Amino acid sequence: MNPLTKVKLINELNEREVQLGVADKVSWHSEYKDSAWIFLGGLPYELTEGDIICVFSQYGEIVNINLVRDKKTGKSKGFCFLCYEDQRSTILAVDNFNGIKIKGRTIRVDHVSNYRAPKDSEEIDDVTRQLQEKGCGART
């Protein structure tokens, strides 16, 4: 099953909801209300984390970022997890940003449930340790 059909399946999830007239208290997103983590998939490999944060900031303030990278070479696998400060920004981003094109590639944005953080057992990098323990965020 091609990834584009996954992008289309989330969009049809939304259109179908509109046709049936479902209320927001029982929307599909309400199953993911507890979490503030969203999966982004299909990204171009040229994008770095400043790019991801630069664009997905339209809907709120990003708390943490996990663009998963190859262990040996360090290059990007293409998918990362973002945590928003508001949980409602996840609704806005899954609706609005699913299936948009960046450098000619469509991306899928979906809610992630019970996201489990990476263990700091590895001492491979330092900046990743800073990102895990502290993470990106405005400083007064």
Residues that bind other proteins (CB under 8 A): 1, 6, 9, 12-13, 16-17, 20, 26-28, 30-31, 39, 110, 112-113
- Smallest distance from other proteins to CB 77, Å: 12
Transcribe 16-71 into DSSP letters. HHHHHT--GGGSGGGGSSS--EEEEES--TT--HHHHHHHHGGGS-EEEEEEEE-T
Complex with other proteins: residue 11 or 128, whichever CB lies closer = 11
Which residue is it, tokens 């895990």? 132
Complex with other proteins: residue 96 or 130, whichever CB lies closer = 96
Specify the 3-state DSSP secondary structure of 105: strand
- Smallest distance from other proteins to CB 23, Å: 11
Residue at 6: amino acid letter? K
Cβ neighbours around 125 below 10 Å, total: 11
The answer to whether 78 and 45 have CB atoms below 8 angstroms apart is: yes
Complex with other proteins: residue 16 or 103, whichever CB lies closer = 16
- Smallest distance from other proteins to CB 20, Å: 8
- Smallest distance from other proteins to CB 29, Å: 9
Complex with other proteins: residue 12 or 85, whichever CB lies closer = 12
Which residue is it, tokens 């997905």? 56
Q: Which helix (H) or strand (E) holds 56?
A: helix 49-56
